[PDB]
């Protein structure tokens, strides 16, 4: 029933901007690199797929990671601890039967003790000001899918996760959601972005052209990346094994 769908859409469109993290934050930090953000998120998605979690858990966890690093200096040895704390917070918020603190202090090979994780939790709740209900791309994808073949959505979510692997932090989550949805639609069946979505979100193809080509080139370069944890995860028939498809060479915009 559409008694609230458009209202929630407008609300999320308003909220996605207030919590938007800074872009150039990574250079300010002394000892961390974008390569290192990629390594953290790689290990993080590995651990998440281990404990049989949900993808929105990962979305919110990496969002907390981003909004945190953009505001606090840290030494590299603490990045895993912070990532574990963020995943724990995401599980507590969204997931039904949250994996306990013991599992997360174990998976780190006990490089950290429980009390350190608890104090990091105190700190991260302090800095985040207890505002964890941030919007993510996945909600936009799911809302868009209402206007539907399982493979299309699997590919779209795949592209969204690929985007969060690494110029996308300049675009809004709605922007990246639209780009991934349209490119996946073209890849799977060649159809184009229908009018009703443009009426709904106001976004046109022309506005999303830059992120569209960024997503296309990253899609091309993805199969040869140094890390394929998302790829091997999406090699399973649960996601229909769709990670092995060919990246289209050039769009027909």
């Amino acid at each position: 029933v559409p008694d609230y769908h458009e209202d929630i859409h407008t609300y999320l469109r308003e909220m996605e901007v207030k919590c938007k993290p800074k872009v150039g934050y990574m250079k300010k930090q002394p000892d961390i690199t974008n390569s290192m953000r990629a390594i953290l998120v790689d290990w993080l998605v590995e651990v998440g797929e281990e404990y049989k979690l949900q993808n929105e858990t990962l979305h919110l966890a990496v969002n907390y990671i981003d909004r945190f690093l953009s505001s606090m200096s840290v030494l590299r040895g603490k990045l895993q601890l912070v990532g574990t704390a963020a995943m724990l917070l995401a599980s507590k918020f969204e997931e039904i039967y949250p994996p306990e603190v013991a599992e997360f202090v174990y998976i780190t090979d006990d490089t950290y003790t429980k009390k350190q994780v608890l104090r990091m939790e105190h700190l991260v709740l302090k800095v985040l000001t207890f505002d964890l209900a941030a919007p993510t791309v996945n909600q936009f994808l799911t809302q868009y899918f209402l206007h539907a073949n399982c493979k299309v959505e699997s590919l779209a979510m795949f592209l969204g996760e690929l985007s969060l692997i690494d110029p996308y932090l300049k675009y809004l989550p709605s922007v990246i959601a639209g780009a991934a949805f349209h490119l996946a639609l073209y890849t799977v069946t060649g159809q184009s972005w229908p009018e009703s979505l443009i009426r709904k979100t106001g976004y046109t193809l022309e506005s999303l052209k830059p992120c569209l080509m960024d997503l296309h080139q990253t899609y091309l370069k993805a199969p040869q990346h140094a890390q394929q944890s998302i790829r091997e995860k999406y090699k399973n028939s649960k996601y229909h094994g769709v990670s092995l498809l060919n990246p289209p060479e050039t769009l027909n915009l």
Partner: protein, 284 residues
């Protein structure tokens, strides 16, 4: 007896009502409870007169202090004090007005309450009523969520028959139960256990089947060995209530969730388009 210590703060303010709420925190077990996090995050995101406001969050090393907005009296004791005289009808209508406004706001901002009961409703000494207990709230985007909900006396047949999706039409049913016991000072469905609750609901509203509820015989926990009860007189269910309210209740306690009116749809009902604003009659 009745252990606890609570503090107040009343100097210079229109909403001078405040109250401190402390919760114990066991440090080395699960850390902060999921309920606390859900309540804090989903609460400092909403602002409305028909909803209790939060003012600040105090996170110590082992204790959490919450600067809630104080209020006078809940609804259980309020009905109990006037259990023999009844409640004026315009007061009921205004209370229901504020309740439906709050429900529309909460469901518009993607939050489920899932814990409505007259112990979680608070009234002011002027006629304003606000909700509380957002500890069971969760941000829904419809997936499958937690399958243990509000309270046996105010659950809805969606959960009792163990359905897989319970999208935001359960709070409407809970509101129907609360309004009905408002009018009649009698809990409609005082269940003993879940099966007794189902039998009571049936005996009041007749046994469901395919005609009334589409796709009911395919629910996980339906067994046609059920009693063959028929929908009894609606007027005798709630005697002191008029025809317009009888209609509103009929489309407000209907089986099929899709055939159950939502908040904004209810906001424009005739019985409900007539709105007054009285004040409470007893001490708060």
């Amino acid at each position: 007896g009745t252990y606890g210590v609570v503090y107040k703060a009343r100097n210079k303010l229109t909403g001078e009502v405040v109250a401190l709420k402390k919760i114990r925190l066991d440090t080395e077990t699960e850390g902060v409870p999921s309920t606390a996090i859900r309540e804090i995050s989903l609460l400092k995101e909403l602002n409305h007169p028909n909803i209790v406001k939060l003012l600040d969050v105090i996170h110590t090393e082992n204790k959490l202090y919450l600067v809630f907005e104080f209020l006078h009296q809940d609804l259980k004791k309020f009905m109990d004090a006037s259990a023999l005289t009844g409640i004026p009808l315009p007061l009921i209508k205004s209370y229901l007005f504020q309740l439906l406004q709050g429900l529309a706001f909460c469901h518009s901002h993607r939050v489920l309450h899932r814990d409505l009961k007259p112990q979680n409703l608070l009234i002011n000494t002027e006629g304003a009523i606000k909700l509380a207990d957002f500890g069971l709230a969760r941000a829904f985007g419809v997936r499958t969520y937690t399958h243990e909900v509000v309270t046996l006396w105010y659950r809805a047949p969606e959960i009792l028959l163990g359905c897989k999706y319970y999208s935001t039409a359960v709070d409407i049913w809970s509101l129907g139960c609360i309004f009905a016991e408002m009018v009649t000072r009698r809990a409609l469905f005082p269940g003993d256990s879940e099966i007794d609750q189902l039998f009571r609901i049936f005996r009041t509203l007749g046994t469901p089947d395919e005609v009334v509820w589409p796709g009911v015989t395919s629910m996980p926990d339906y067994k046609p060995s059920f009693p063959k009860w028929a929908r009894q007189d609606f007027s005798k269910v709630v005697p002191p209530l008029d025809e317009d309210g009888r209609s509103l209740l009929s489309q407000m306690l209907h089986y099929d969730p899709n055939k159950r009116i939502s908040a904004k749809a209810a906001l424009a009902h005739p019985f409900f388009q007539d709105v007054t604003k009285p004040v409470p009659h007893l001490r708060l």
